[PDB]
Amino acid sequence: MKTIFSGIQPSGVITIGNYIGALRQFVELQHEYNCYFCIVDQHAITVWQDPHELRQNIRRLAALYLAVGIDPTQATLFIQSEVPAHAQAAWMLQCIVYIGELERMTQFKEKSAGKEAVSAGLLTYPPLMAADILLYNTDIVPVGEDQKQHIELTRDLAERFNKRYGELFTIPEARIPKVGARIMSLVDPTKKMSKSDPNPKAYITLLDDAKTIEKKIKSAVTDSEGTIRYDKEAKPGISNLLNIYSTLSGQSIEELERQYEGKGYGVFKADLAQVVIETLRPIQERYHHWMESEELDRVLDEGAEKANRVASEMVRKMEQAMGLGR
Amino acid sequence: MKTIFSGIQPSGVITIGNYIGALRQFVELQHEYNCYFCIVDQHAITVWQDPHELRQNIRRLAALYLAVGIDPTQATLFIQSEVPAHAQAAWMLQCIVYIGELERMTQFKEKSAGKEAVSAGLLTYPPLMAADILLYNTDIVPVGEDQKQHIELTRDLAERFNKRYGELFTIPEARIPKVGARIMSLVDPTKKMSKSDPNPKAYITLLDDAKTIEKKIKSAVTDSEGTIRYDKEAKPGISNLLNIYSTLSGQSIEELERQYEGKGYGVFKADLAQVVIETLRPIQERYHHWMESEELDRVLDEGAEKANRVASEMVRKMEQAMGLGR
Ligand SMILES: Nc1ncnc2c1ncn2[C@@H]1O[C@H](COP(=O)(O)OC(=O)[C@@H](N)Cc2c[nH]c3ccccc23)[C@@H](O)[C@H]1O
Ligand SMILES: Nc1ncnc2c1ncn2[C@@H]1O[C@H](COP(=O)(O)OC(=O)[C@@H](N)Cc2c[nH]c3ccccc23)[C@@H](O)[C@H]1O
Ligand SMILES: [N+]
Ligand SMILES: [N+]
């Protein structure tokens, strides 16, 4: 069967945008593919991290993955740093990528914007992501739209390596949701919902309580049409709300538009907030159980064992192809 | 006792400049320090390498290290790629180094000069070299003058890491020969003798036969003074020859100047060439023995075992300091 790989950075804020664009895909696809889901801690350190928060955020993210329903018997869940192959593969790929290719990455340009003094990990972020994916002979990489370009570069690297050293890598392909590929800020619906937004009202975290979710949904910027119709360009706010509602409820955009024919934003928002709470509650309760269990570490231990067996062998093949070592 | 670390890239050409600036130091210091001598294959791939040549060049360099007298009971000889910690440590250090710091490296500027399309490994060469050194709690790094700046950056990184995450690294210090720190081209004595010089008469390789050495020494560009006196600025050619003679013969520059008082360049060059042959012959014969022995691999195997035990533990400490993993 085919292989899937996907990663998420461990951080203080895991949003419903991460859930809808990614985690929901992981759970959907886990039984049909060989799955590798990673907590990308080495990618997290591309920007300064408080060490204590990082260690906690890594456990938090593992807990959320399992809380959302990632099943360790169906998928391999692990921490990037615990599989040395990623760093090994990243170095080899860094040697074949051009500086200009890295410089044109939008993620890099955005994260480095208006900085003095940019840390190099930010620039070399892609080769490490390419190594993440290529290590496992990945076919499909389920992500939100913001990762598309990185995966395009990964494809370029895989092809370059294969041309130079002999066919070794499978050329991976992004799988990006039709609806919910890019969940926007509740505060400014022309902007992507980001885990680093200085305004906490811009995102809903997976651990937000009911009152908080209600406040954030109610406050979500809309328009003065009082019409619940999807129109990304004309009604960015309501359209984004419709995407969240659709993806989380399972109802189609058309279904919701009819359901709310003649209705105002007030009833819509109240109903949406209930849909968000309904989604998050069971996740939160499963999350706290994981956070207090010794089983969390056992799952990660098993995930790292499997990941290492696979990635280490690919690293051997990579080295043999380039002539490194012996 | 203190610790020494030093590396050399495996390449088609290992020169008497590598011998005089480095290898001679390794042998001199091996009994008094804990020594780690590395074949930097991951650094070699910062420029394209034919895979077959690379694999051979790595064995060739191991053979030369042992041929020159590196003793496996006194030092640890190993291949960089066979110790995953180097790549792991390099990533962590890449996350703390600034792009501008890498961009100002002279080695990078020179190797990337007049290129289109520069491969990223060339730019990230330093963090990997810093990881090489810092992994082993290195005190002293014996090299020729051309590596001084890289070691300065390594010191900057070690201090930065220690300030941010707690004191972990020893701040390493270069040890650069007083005489022979920078052996120059025999063809243009204002240029460093380089393994990549398009003119084979510019360098003497450790495997050059007697006739070849004589031809290269005889042809070495001098001046029209017929005076054998050291004067780097005024007589770059003769001064460089004097440095080679001094370092290889054990005689001081003063000693040689007196020995050749009233003599012409012809007798000087003939005598120098004999000194080079006298040096290289036993090295070459030991080199061919190593190249045909199964013991070469056994030495590297043992070197990688020891290096891994040490570097892997430092990597654990590094991760704990940054909060990576668990
Ligand atoms: N507003 C949003 N709307 C929809 N989807 C969104 C939204 N915000 C985030 N996502 C998706 O969530 C996943 C994790 O996001 P990260 O920022 O940790 O995503 C990142 O920082 C990656 N560099 C981590 C990574 C490292 N290696 C990998 C290998 C394969 C795939 C991914 C990775 C991603 O799928 C992201 O697209
Ligand atoms: N003309 C010359 N005169 C005097 N000394 C010279 C001359 N040419 C070369 N050297 C010295 O030889 C050693 C190996 O050279 P490399 O180019 O492989 O040297 C290099 O390419 C390093 N980046 C390899 C390295 C990787 N990691 C390390 C950690 C510690 C020390 C060294 C390394 C060096 O000591 C170099 O200074
Ligand atoms: N599966
Ligand atoms: N020693």
XYZ file of C-alpha atoms and ligand atoms in Angstrom:
728
model
C 0.000 0.000 0.000
C 1.111 3.592 -0.421
C 2.925 5.665 2.129
C 2.037 8.846 3.823
C 4.242 11.211 5.741
C 3.324 14.428 7.502
C 4.709 16.689 10.152
C 3.652 19.391 12.617
C 5.895 21.648 14.665
C 5.421 21.357 18.402
C 4.310 24.825 19.611
C 2.392 26.717 22.246
C -0.490 26.988 19.859
C -2.028 24.168 17.834
C -5.076 25.707 15.950
C -8.293 24.483 14.391
C -6.544 25.485 11.070
C -3.936 22.687 11.868
C -6.827 20.389 12.658
C -8.896 21.075 9.565
C -5.995 21.362 7.052
C -4.041 18.393 8.434
C -4.915 16.326 11.506
C -8.414 15.567 10.111
C -6.679 14.167 6.978
C -4.326 12.004 9.131
C -7.224 10.334 10.884
C -9.145 9.916 7.628
C -6.270 8.253 5.816
C -4.580 6.220 8.552
C -6.246 2.882 7.848
C -5.639 2.881 4.055
C -1.874 3.800 4.021
C 1.421 3.163 5.779
C 1.577 6.312 7.880
C 4.368 8.276 9.475
C 3.294 11.299 11.565
C 5.963 13.384 13.037
C 6.537 15.940 15.733
C 9.122 18.154 13.940
C 11.177 19.390 16.886
C 14.281 20.035 14.832
C 12.154 22.257 12.585
C 10.732 23.937 15.743
C 14.231 25.113 16.679
C 14.634 27.085 13.455
C 13.393 29.951 15.659
C 14.472 30.325 19.277
C 12.575 28.090 21.688
C 12.449 28.176 25.449
C 13.800 24.715 26.272
C 11.206 23.960 28.965
C 8.305 25.023 26.744
C 9.674 23.048 23.891
C 9.903 19.804 25.840
C 6.281 20.364 27.003
C 5.013 21.359 23.567
C 6.459 18.203 22.131
C 4.510 16.084 24.685
C 1.459 18.310 24.089
C 1.535 17.756 20.389
C 1.984 13.906 20.798
C -1.073 13.995 23.140
C -3.118 15.982 20.587
C -2.197 13.618 17.800
C -3.482 10.664 19.831
C -6.425 12.718 21.180
C -7.662 13.473 17.707
C -7.675 9.748 17.015
C -4.247 8.877 15.486
C -4.058 5.128 16.209
C -0.561 3.738 16.993
C -1.534 0.345 15.534
C -2.326 2.018 12.206
C 0.383 4.712 12.202
C 3.818 5.531 13.341
C 3.971 8.549 15.559
C 7.356 9.881 16.436
C 9.607 12.736 17.261
C 11.900 13.993 14.424
C 15.018 14.390 16.691
C 14.793 10.788 17.889
C 15.540 9.509 14.323
C 19.121 10.683 13.462
C 18.480 9.870 9.795
C 16.564 13.035 9.348
C 19.560 15.220 10.157
C 21.839 12.884 8.029
C 19.535 13.020 5.040
C 19.055 16.764 5.473
C 22.829 17.384 5.160
C 23.035 15.343 1.924
C 20.077 17.184 0.501
C 21.460 20.588 1.612
C 24.534 19.707 -0.543
C 22.402 19.399 -3.655
C 19.987 22.304 -3.162
C 20.963 25.743 -4.440
C 21.000 28.790 -2.183
C 18.664 30.640 -4.589
C 16.125 27.806 -4.341
C 16.053 28.186 -0.565
C 15.942 31.976 -0.738
C 12.770 32.016 -2.850
C 10.732 29.958 -0.380
C 7.793 32.049 0.792
C 7.956 30.529 4.265
C 11.537 31.731 4.551
C 10.819 35.161 3.168
C 7.907 35.625 5.592
C 9.606 34.289 8.712
C 12.719 36.297 7.999
C 10.949 39.467 6.951
C 12.355 42.609 8.733
C 15.013 40.893 10.561
C 18.242 41.713 11.161
C 20.029 38.758 11.512
C 18.530 35.722 10.378
C 19.312 32.311 11.821
C 20.490 29.770 9.201
C 18.038 27.030 10.175
C 15.293 29.271 8.824
C 16.955 29.203 5.386
C 17.786 25.474 5.484
C 14.336 24.556 6.658
C 13.424 22.880 3.351
C 16.184 20.321 2.961
C 15.274 19.004 6.415
C 11.549 18.797 5.377
C 12.579 17.052 2.133
C 14.596 14.527 4.185
C 11.517 13.996 6.424
C 9.399 12.992 3.473
C 11.906 11.227 1.206
C 13.314 9.048 3.979
C 10.143 6.930 4.075
C 9.667 6.443 0.317
C 6.621 8.651 0.678
C 3.872 8.728 -1.891
C 1.433 11.246 -0.324
C 2.018 14.227 1.962
C -1.244 15.522 3.474
C -0.927 19.184 4.411
C -2.665 22.503 4.211
C -1.957 24.844 1.240
C 0.903 26.769 2.979
C 3.214 23.650 2.622
C 2.655 23.178 -1.103
C 5.795 25.095 -2.168
C 8.036 23.127 0.234
C 6.705 19.924 -1.156
C 7.341 21.271 -4.724
C 11.022 21.813 -3.660
C 11.126 18.352 -2.134
C 9.972 16.938 -5.497
C 12.743 19.033 -7.252
C 15.345 17.620 -4.818
C 14.192 14.037 -5.155
C 14.355 14.343 -8.992
C 17.791 16.005 -8.817
C 19.169 13.296 -6.548
C 17.667 10.519 -8.694
C 19.138 12.077 -11.903
C 22.603 12.549 -10.372
C 22.929 9.353 -8.339
C 20.489 6.819 -9.689
C 16.732 6.378 -9.026
C 16.278 5.997 -5.275
C 13.399 8.246 -4.176
C 9.738 8.075 -4.860
C 8.576 11.481 -6.046
C 6.043 12.490 -3.291
C 2.815 14.370 -3.997
C 0.921 16.848 -1.727
C -2.716 16.001 -0.772
C -4.376 19.310 0.138
C -8.041 19.477 1.270
C -10.507 20.921 -1.190
C -12.297 22.749 1.631
C -10.296 23.962 4.580
C -6.828 24.013 2.872
C -6.355 27.478 4.196
C -8.381 28.451 7.280
C -8.184 32.199 7.814
C -7.833 34.488 10.827
C -11.207 35.155 12.542
C -9.953 38.684 13.028
C -8.774 39.381 9.484
C -10.183 36.817 7.074
C -7.734 37.909 4.331
C -4.911 36.434 6.445
C -4.192 32.814 7.203
C -5.012 31.635 10.702
C -1.553 31.452 12.301
C -0.314 29.840 15.497
C 1.880 33.093 15.956
C -0.833 35.656 15.546
C -0.282 38.263 18.332
C -4.130 38.468 18.571
C -5.479 35.363 20.325
C -8.922 36.124 18.872
C -7.498 35.306 15.439
C -7.314 31.605 16.121
C -9.040 28.924 18.056
C -6.613 26.557 19.783
C -7.584 22.910 20.225
C -7.553 23.481 24.001
C -9.856 26.589 24.024
C -12.780 26.194 26.472
C -16.414 26.599 25.501
C -16.774 30.203 26.630
C -13.588 31.109 24.767
C -14.743 29.448 21.572
C -18.045 31.221 21.756
C -16.329 34.580 22.257
C -13.990 33.966 19.288
C -16.686 32.780 16.888
C -19.099 35.528 17.888
C -16.406 38.163 17.398
C -15.325 36.757 14.010
C -15.297 39.611 11.513
C -18.018 39.298 8.885
C -19.684 41.820 6.598
C -22.952 43.804 6.429
C -24.901 41.516 4.097
C -26.593 39.296 6.641
C -26.401 36.691 3.893
C -24.852 33.316 4.503
C -23.376 32.507 1.140
C -19.847 31.358 0.238
C -17.886 33.947 -1.709
C -14.179 34.015 -0.791
C -13.480 37.286 -2.545
C -16.583 39.308 -1.595
C -17.323 37.779 1.803
C -14.008 36.435 3.133
C -15.210 36.350 6.786
C -18.461 34.408 6.291
C -16.828 32.116 3.731
C -14.108 31.128 6.159
C -16.759 30.505 8.813
C -18.626 28.378 6.323
C -15.432 26.376 5.644
C -14.922 25.726 9.333
C -18.574 24.744 9.760
C -18.566 22.468 6.704
C -15.351 20.678 7.511
C -16.197 20.165 11.174
C -19.870 19.229 10.757
C -19.555 17.113 7.651
C -22.235 19.218 5.985
C -21.481 20.690 2.605
C -21.272 24.392 1.923
C -24.469 24.101 -0.142
C -26.198 22.250 2.668
C -25.301 25.027 5.142
C -26.282 27.827 2.800
C -29.780 26.300 2.498
C -29.965 25.518 6.166
C -29.354 29.166 6.840
C -31.392 30.622 4.024
C -33.063 33.753 5.429
C -31.143 33.447 8.721
C -28.821 36.073 10.220
C -25.158 35.819 11.351
C -26.143 35.659 14.977
C -27.882 32.289 14.808
C -25.204 31.023 12.386
C -22.353 31.956 14.739
C -24.062 30.476 17.764
C -24.623 27.218 15.938
C -20.970 27.250 14.597
C -19.545 27.767 18.053
C -21.564 24.797 19.307
C -20.141 22.749 16.370
C -16.580 23.788 17.419
C -17.226 22.927 21.028
C -18.756 19.572 20.059
C -15.548 18.815 18.104
C -13.082 19.996 20.713
C -14.598 18.625 23.888
C -13.880 14.896 23.293
C -10.439 15.886 21.972
C -9.639 17.813 25.097
C -10.761 15.127 27.427
C -8.663 12.480 25.568
C -5.745 14.983 25.581
C -5.683 15.343 29.352
C -5.752 11.569 29.768
C -2.746 11.198 27.420
C -0.855 14.021 29.188
C -1.060 12.127 32.487
C -0.246 8.692 31.106
C 2.977 6.726 30.861
C 1.508 5.313 27.642
C 2.277 8.549 25.794
C 6.037 7.775 26.012
C 5.509 4.139 25.079
C 3.729 5.145 21.890
C 6.557 7.577 20.929
C 9.165 4.921 21.831
C 7.552 2.434 19.457
C 7.086 5.079 16.775
C 10.862 6.050 16.955
C 11.891 2.341 16.755
C 9.976 1.826 13.540
C 10.940 5.187 12.014
C 14.610 4.490 12.752
C 14.533 1.092 11.080
C 13.124 2.593 7.925
C 14.929 5.902 7.763
C 18.348 4.459 8.689
C 18.157 2.043 5.712
C 17.246 4.813 3.338
C 20.207 6.792 4.696
C 22.474 3.785 3.917
C 21.162 3.742 0.334
C 21.576 7.528 0.043
C 25.241 7.268 1.251
C 25.982 4.375 -1.123
C 24.568 6.430 -4.012
C 26.745 9.464 -3.231
C 29.826 7.331 -2.288
C 29.973 8.553 1.288
C 31.598 6.381 3.842
C 32.391 2.751 2.968
C 44.760 15.262 29.300
C 43.580 17.718 26.675
C 41.753 16.871 23.508
C 42.598 17.420 19.936
C 40.368 17.247 16.914
C 41.243 17.765 13.273
C 39.842 16.957 9.891
C 40.872 16.604 6.243
C 38.608 16.262 3.231
C 39.121 13.096 1.235
C 40.180 14.209 -2.281
C 42.088 13.254 -5.388
C 44.942 15.385 -4.210
C 46.513 15.360 -0.754
C 49.514 17.845 -0.895
C 52.739 18.427 0.987
C 50.942 21.660 2.176
C 48.393 19.305 3.971
C 51.332 17.355 5.321
C 53.360 20.285 6.593
C 50.432 22.422 7.886
C 48.544 19.510 9.465
C 49.483 15.828 9.288
C 52.983 16.559 10.697
C 51.245 18.211 13.703
C 48.951 15.152 14.180
C 51.894 12.802 14.451
C 53.793 15.203 16.708
C 50.932 15.617 19.150
C 49.304 12.178 19.169
C 51.025 10.786 22.254
C 50.383 13.822 24.519
C 46.602 14.328 23.836
C 43.335 12.476 23.330
C 43.141 12.661 19.551
C 40.330 12.498 17.049
C 41.367 12.638 13.366
C 38.674 12.649 10.839
C 38.079 11.994 7.185
C 35.438 14.706 6.498
C 33.388 13.038 3.770
C 30.254 15.015 4.503
C 32.321 18.182 4.037
C 33.740 16.672 0.794
C 30.229 16.556 -0.676
C 29.761 20.313 -0.336
C 30.970 20.271 -3.963
C 29.918 17.568 -6.408
C 31.877 14.335 -6.066
C 32.035 11.367 -8.376
C 30.755 8.621 -6.073
C 33.386 6.055 -7.094
C 36.248 8.525 -6.652
C 34.888 9.616 -3.354
C 34.736 6.115 -1.907
C 38.358 5.579 -3.082
C 39.576 8.955 -1.847
C 38.174 8.204 1.557
C 40.185 4.926 1.720
C 43.190 6.786 0.259
C 43.090 9.426 2.908
C 42.714 6.798 5.762
C 45.790 5.024 4.267
C 47.776 8.295 4.173
C 46.872 9.110 7.740
C 48.229 5.743 8.892
C 51.146 5.935 6.412
C 52.338 9.197 7.862
C 52.413 7.536 11.267
C 48.986 8.183 12.908
C 48.872 5.368 15.490
C 45.409 3.847 16.172
C 46.429 3.016 19.758
C 47.161 6.700 20.388
C 44.403 8.258 18.252
C 40.965 7.768 16.947
C 40.777 7.781 13.203
C 37.377 7.807 11.641
C 35.081 8.804 8.877
C 32.741 11.790 9.578
C 29.636 10.149 7.937
C 29.938 7.045 10.115
C 29.182 9.136 13.273
C 25.572 10.462 12.876
C 26.194 12.934 15.706
C 28.048 15.213 13.413
C 25.021 15.809 11.204
C 22.766 16.087 14.368
C 25.039 18.610 16.018
C 25.455 20.500 12.748
C 21.668 21.052 12.471
C 21.469 22.433 16.040
C 24.380 24.725 15.381
C 22.946 25.834 11.997
C 19.869 26.985 14.017
C 21.978 29.340 16.098
C 24.345 30.717 13.449
C 23.295 33.773 11.456
C 23.223 33.774 7.665
C 25.503 36.850 7.590
C 28.095 35.010 9.696
C 28.195 32.204 7.141
C 28.235 34.602 4.199
C 31.386 36.379 5.396
C 33.484 33.207 5.559
C 36.395 33.563 3.155
C 36.291 29.866 2.309
C 32.692 30.287 1.206
C 33.335 33.452 -0.733
C 36.260 31.835 -2.575
C 34.614 28.503 -3.345
C 31.459 30.214 -4.505
C 33.162 32.975 -6.443
C 31.715 33.388 -10.015
C 29.105 30.851 -9.701
C 25.868 30.798 -10.688
C 24.138 28.725 -8.507
C 25.681 27.855 -5.407
C 24.975 24.652 -3.519
C 23.819 25.221 0.093
C 26.329 22.853 1.692
C 29.020 25.322 0.671
C 27.328 28.012 2.788
C 26.566 25.700 5.733
C 30.043 24.272 5.740
C 30.955 25.947 9.047
C 28.238 24.687 11.361
C 29.204 21.145 10.354
C 32.922 21.924 11.103
C 31.894 23.472 14.447
C 29.942 20.284 15.271
C 33.051 18.225 14.337
C 35.160 20.036 16.881
C 32.664 20.761 19.672
C 31.321 17.211 19.783
C 34.531 15.930 21.398
C 34.982 18.667 24.023
C 37.990 19.747 22.007
C 40.714 21.906 23.450
C 43.121 22.191 20.472
C 42.503 22.118 16.722
C 45.754 21.734 14.751
C 45.379 23.156 11.254
C 47.055 25.324 8.691
C 46.278 29.091 8.587
C 43.400 28.789 6.031
C 41.143 27.176 8.770
C 41.675 29.897 11.362
C 38.492 31.838 10.486
C 36.309 28.695 10.656
C 37.685 27.930 14.045
C 36.992 31.586 15.093
C 33.311 30.988 14.058
C 33.284 27.699 15.930
C 34.433 29.580 19.058
C 31.609 32.187 18.446
C 29.055 29.344 18.155
C 30.270 27.502 21.223
C 30.066 30.763 23.264
C 26.603 31.550 21.856
C 25.294 28.090 22.694
C 26.827 28.187 26.188
C 25.299 31.666 26.862
C 21.840 30.654 25.602
C 21.590 27.113 26.962
C 24.064 26.733 29.779
C 27.833 26.006 29.704
C 28.329 22.774 27.773
C 31.177 23.282 25.284
C 34.834 23.797 25.796
C 35.923 26.797 23.756
C 38.462 25.231 21.282
C 41.649 26.976 20.162
C 43.518 26.662 16.803
C 47.179 25.456 16.881
C 48.787 26.726 13.666
C 52.458 25.982 12.825
C 54.875 28.863 13.107
C 56.658 27.717 9.943
C 54.661 26.034 7.230
C 51.178 27.374 8.238
C 50.655 28.364 4.670
C 52.691 26.503 2.033
C 52.430 28.302 -1.293
C 52.066 27.238 -4.924
C 55.442 26.318 -6.511
C 54.129 28.006 -9.624
C 52.905 31.247 -8.062
C 54.339 31.682 -4.580
C 51.846 34.490 -3.802
C 49.069 31.864 -3.850
C 48.422 29.086 -1.387
C 49.295 25.588 -2.531
C 45.855 24.133 -3.305
C 44.675 20.584 -3.902
C 42.426 22.111 -6.768
C 45.089 24.016 -8.608
C 44.516 23.319 -12.356
C 48.361 23.319 -12.698
C 49.783 20.086 -11.261
C 53.197 21.769 -11.039
C 51.758 24.014 -8.324
C 51.647 21.259 -5.755
C 53.439 18.140 -4.770
C 51.071 15.300 -3.874
C 52.112 12.791 -1.217
C 52.105 10.097 -3.925
C 54.352 11.971 -6.455
C 57.305 9.822 -7.623
C 60.921 10.909 -7.403
C 61.226 12.155 -10.974
C 58.008 14.133 -10.563
C 59.164 15.731 -7.336
C 62.434 16.698 -8.901
C 60.662 18.265 -11.881
C 58.307 20.242 -9.599
C 61.002 21.513 -7.241
C 63.375 22.389 -10.066
C 60.630 24.302 -11.867
C 59.543 26.167 -8.710
C 59.441 29.872 -9.515
C 62.144 31.846 -7.724
C 63.743 35.214 -8.403
C 66.972 36.591 -9.926
C 68.941 37.137 -6.717
C 70.696 33.802 -6.464
C 70.526 34.456 -2.733
C 69.044 31.929 -0.371
C 67.553 34.121 2.295
C 64.037 34.098 3.788
C 62.012 37.168 2.885
C 58.313 36.404 2.318
C 57.539 39.748 0.741
C 60.613 40.244 -1.477
C 61.412 36.618 -2.279
C 58.133 34.689 -1.962
C 59.370 31.726 -4.080
C 62.651 31.027 -2.255
C 61.037 31.689 1.126
C 58.358 29.101 0.498
C 61.043 26.647 -0.606
C 62.926 27.414 2.569
C 59.762 26.710 4.611
C 59.298 23.350 2.940
C 62.971 22.488 3.442
C 62.977 23.589 7.090
C 59.801 21.816 8.076
C 60.690 18.583 6.299
C 64.376 18.428 7.266
C 64.071 19.657 10.818
C 66.697 22.297 10.095
C 65.885 25.875 10.932
C 65.603 28.623 8.366
C 68.787 30.167 9.801
C 70.574 26.839 9.599
C 69.650 26.488 5.903
C 70.558 30.055 5.039
C 74.080 29.452 6.414
C 74.313 26.043 4.856
C 73.642 27.662 1.530
C 75.628 30.827 2.019
C 77.255 31.593 -1.348
C 75.370 28.732 -3.046
C 73.015 29.049 -6.026
C 69.367 27.923 -6.463
C 70.388 24.933 -8.503
C 72.187 23.094 -5.710
C 69.510 24.237 -3.226
C 66.664 22.851 -5.351
C 68.427 19.571 -5.980
C 69.030 19.109 -2.280
C 65.365 20.138 -1.475
C 63.962 17.644 -3.934
C 66.046 14.905 -2.314
C 64.634 16.019 1.093
C 61.064 15.731 -0.334
C 61.759 12.331 -1.798
C 63.341 11.140 1.461
C 60.129 12.202 3.262
C 57.666 10.764 0.783
C 59.236 7.425 -0.021
C 58.579 5.670 3.336
C 55.109 7.258 3.359
C 54.303 5.880 -0.044
C 55.495 2.431 0.717
C 53.429 2.309 3.969
C 50.466 3.737 1.977
C 50.431 0.920 -0.557
C 50.573 -1.659 2.226
C 47.553 -0.048 3.950
C 45.627 0.177 0.647
C 45.897 -3.596 0.202
C 45.133 -4.547 3.791
C 41.944 -5.579 5.546
C 43.408 -3.807 8.584
C 42.564 -0.410 7.092
C 38.821 -1.115 7.618
C 39.406 -2.520 11.090
C 41.138 0.673 12.165
C 38.258 2.842 10.809
C 35.707 0.489 12.429
C 37.343 0.944 15.826
C 37.736 4.682 15.294
C 33.945 5.047 14.441
C 32.982 2.980 17.550
C 34.876 5.292 19.861
C 33.838 8.501 18.078
C 30.188 7.426 18.232
C 30.311 6.748 21.957
C 31.664 10.202 22.617
C 29.799 12.269 20.072
C 26.414 10.604 20.710
C 26.621 11.561 24.423
C 27.461 15.133 23.603
C 24.477 15.166 21.232
C 22.258 13.961 24.131
C 23.538 16.838 26.288
C 23.053 19.318 23.424
C 19.404 18.127 22.947
C 18.694 18.298 26.691
C 20.044 21.867 26.748
C 17.819 23.007 23.865
C 14.786 20.923 25.045
C 14.650 18.776 21.936
C 13.088 15.401 22.174
C 12.353 13.928 25.618
N -4.651 27.958 8.687
C -4.464 26.722 8.254
N -5.342 26.153 7.439
C -5.134 24.902 7.032
N -4.110 24.082 7.327
C -3.214 24.714 8.106
C -3.310 25.984 8.597
N -2.203 26.302 9.359
C -1.460 25.241 9.318
N -2.001 24.213 8.576
C -1.489 22.880 8.301
O -1.198 22.193 9.486
C -0.040 21.351 9.371
C 0.926 21.710 10.464
O 1.295 23.069 10.405
P 2.845 23.571 10.857
O 2.961 25.062 10.764
O 3.384 22.806 12.104
O 3.602 22.920 9.391
C 4.932 23.083 9.221
O 5.554 23.922 9.861
C 5.608 22.085 8.278
N 6.877 22.734 7.780
C 5.952 20.883 9.189
C 6.648 19.719 8.453
C 7.990 19.412 8.698
N 8.260 18.365 7.913
C 7.179 18.003 7.197
C 6.981 16.960 6.259
C 5.722 16.788 5.642
C 4.661 17.658 5.967
C 4.861 18.666 6.899
C 6.087 18.860 7.522
C 0.517 21.577 7.944
O -0.052 20.561 7.146
C -0.048 22.950 7.620
O -0.276 23.116 6.245
N 48.983 25.011 1.626
C 48.814 24.620 2.878
N 49.695 24.952 3.813
C 49.506 24.530 5.062
N 48.500 23.787 5.555
C 47.599 23.521 4.591
C 47.677 23.885 3.277
N 46.572 23.441 2.578
C 45.847 22.829 3.461
N 46.400 22.824 4.725
C 45.910 22.242 5.964
O 45.642 20.875 5.813
C 44.499 20.446 6.568
C 43.537 19.764 5.637
O 43.143 20.614 4.584
P 41.587 20.521 3.926
O 41.444 21.482 2.785
O 41.074 19.054 3.802
O 40.829 21.297 5.329
C 39.495 21.507 5.311
O 38.864 21.481 4.261
C 38.829 21.658 6.680
N 37.544 22.421 6.467
C 38.514 20.204 7.106
C 37.833 20.090 8.486
C 36.500 19.686 8.600
N 36.242 19.688 9.910
C 37.322 20.068 10.617
C 37.530 20.204 12.012
C 38.786 20.620 12.506
C 39.835 20.896 11.605
C 39.625 20.744 10.241
C 38.401 20.337 9.726
C 43.925 21.716 7.241
O 44.505 21.763 8.527
C 44.461 22.804 6.326
O 44.674 24.011 7.009
N -2.218 1.668 8.331
N 47.023 9.603 22.978
